[PDB]
Write a protein that binds this ligand. Structure first.
Ligand SMILES: Cc1cc2nc3c(=O)[nH]c(=O)nc-3n(C[C@H](O)[C@H](O)[C@H](O)COP(=O)(O)OP(=O)(O)OC[C@H]3O[C@@H](n4cnc5c(N)ncnc54)[C@H](O)[C@@H]3O)c2cc1C
Ligand SMILES: Cc1cc2nc3c(=O)[nH]c(=O)nc-3n(C[C@H](O)[C@H](O)[C@H](O)COP(=O)(O)OP(=O)(O)OC[C@H]3O[C@@H](n4cnc5c(N)ncnc54)[C@H](O)[C@@H]3O)c2cc1C
Ligand SMILES: [Cl-]
Ligand SMILES: [Cl-]
Ligand SMILES: [Cl-]
Lengths: 261, 259
């Protein structure tokens, strides 16, 4: 068989919302298939969003507290706040991590961004590895999360056409790049194509049934779907330390698309 | 003599950001401008938008982030912290958002200012939806006539944000903010001020940051805005909201939204 360990990070303030419905569907679907599921329901946990000096469990390491170096010490010395530590343990436990949220101002809800900011410590999600001739940190297809898969599940009010290649909001995959490339591929996840639902504010029973069918199909194929083929940083595709794509790859092109093989 | 609102997100007053914030405030005041500040961490800003913000029971069967904002804003029941920020915004001619880049985006506390202040009736959901207009947004809206600018500190190098740099081009990474959050409700958006390699800033580097910052501040009403395209004034097909085919012909992606 092979029972997978799935962690769902979920950001919506109302349990009877569309998002709440889809969350409950996904959790039941995965449990019925034989997988184990842990959930971080950020609003239910009253998750603290603003990273600050109370998270480091120690006085400042230098003359004044620094978001970076104070994390580096807290993580290395074992003083981080206990909420942080429990999330980090969930991530280490999981084989697959799913982030589920409504699109709010073209980005994660604040409370979810605060999960990123606080959980992704120095020594854990960044700051790991050497800086040398041909290696510039353990990131972008390397890091703590190598071997794990991640996927977003996003609901949006705008129409699909509004997120099309010439659509005014920007192409969906480019708007999601800071998340999928910067937050998921960065600490070493294999990132699956996102599941994005459009025109969600008017969802009725028939649209919901369509959403559920699409969701179940993604959840059934989590370990078969091909990841987004983002380029690794440290294995020849980029010049180091400029971290620019070598001239023979995607020649004469620039922008977000050059980072896909 | 201009009215400038600074929205500022950093937890430590002695930080590099705190030093830049103080410099900017003093520089603007010495020039004769009036400055209001929203120091989010100092105010203990609530970041998570929820039902406690709408000041009333749910308008329908269960609270909805959209419709309960529409009603709170229309009926005057939003939480007082929100109202006070909306008042600042209406007061200001120029709004500056100052933050360290954290995970290629604003700190959560600032994202939560956006999520909670930008109400239905204020920043979105205003106006006609038809075949000729699709909401008062993207170069139209409540903020038309105001200017906005980002001031961003990043740890990564400039080259890492270059057009072929691994983190993505800086202006593409900042698109959801500049186009999605600032141009959307009607600001003219000035080019961002972005400082790189900030974790190693020394006296010399700080002097260079200060000089760049002063220069931007001295030109806030002279600098040309980012030439983003208005949604409703002919560049786009409505309601598909796709750029009309003779403009940037054959091209696609974020760059087609600038003329
Ligand atoms: C602050 C904010 C910013 C936003 N920014 C953007 C943006 O940048 N881009 C964008 O495209 N959109 C944006 N939106 C819209 C947003 O993405 C949608 O409102 C959100 O995705 C809807 O999901 P929800 O869970 O909140 O839906 P809810 O409002 O809870 O519900 C939506 C509909 O689904 C129905 N529903 C619930 N459960 C069921 C069921 N079981 N069967 C059938 N129907 C069901 C509901 O009755 C309701 O009609 C924004 C909204 C807010 C509040
Ligand atoms: C959670 C997190 C996520 C991050 N993600 C990203 C990312 O996605 N992209 C990226 O590029 N970067 C990233 N960074 C790096 C971040 O952008 C930088 O740490 C930040 O810009 C530094 O600004 P600060 O105010 O926190 O600096 P501080 O840490 O306060 O100070 C930085 C340096 O400036 C010096 N300094 C302060 N005042 C002065 C002065 N008056 N004169 C001379 N020197 C001065 C300090 O001594 C210190 O060396 C991340 C950092 C964190 C904590
Ligand atoms: Cl790193
Ligand atoms: Cl709108
Ligand atoms: Cl045309």
């Amino acid at each position: 068989f092979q029972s997978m360990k799935v962690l769902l990070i979920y950001a919506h303030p109302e349990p009877r919302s569309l998002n709440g419905a889809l969350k409950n569907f996904a959790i039941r679907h995965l449990q019925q298939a034989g997988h184990e599921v842990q959930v971080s329901d950020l609003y239910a946990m009253r998750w603290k969003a603003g990273y600050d000096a109370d998270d480091s469990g120690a006085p400042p390491v230098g003359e004044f507290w620094r978001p970076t170096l104070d994390s580096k010490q807290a993580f290395a010395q074992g003083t981080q706040s206990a909420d942080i530590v429990a999330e980090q343990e969930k991530l280490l436990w999981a084989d697959t991590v799913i982030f589920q949220f409504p699109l709010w101002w073209f980005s994660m809800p604040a409370i979810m961004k605060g999960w990123i900011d606080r959980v992704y410590a120095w020594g854990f999600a960044y700051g790991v590895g050497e800086h040398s001739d041909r290696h510039w940190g353990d990131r972008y297809g390397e890091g703590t999360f190598v071997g794990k898969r991640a996927m977003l599940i996003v609901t949006a009010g705008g129409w699909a056409e509004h997120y099309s290649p010439r659509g005014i909001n920007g192409p969906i995959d480019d708007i999601l790049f800071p998340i999928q490339h910067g937050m998921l591929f960065y600490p070493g996840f294999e990132v699956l194509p996102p599941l994005v639902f459009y025109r969600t504010d008017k969802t009725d029973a028939g649209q919901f049934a369509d959403q559920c069918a699409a969701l179940a199909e993604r959840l059934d194929t989590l370990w078969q779907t091909e990841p987004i083929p983002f380029r690794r940083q440290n294995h020849g595709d980029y010049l180091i330390p400029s971290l620019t794509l070598r001239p023979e790859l995607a020649p004469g092109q620039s922008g977000l698309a050059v980072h896909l093989a």
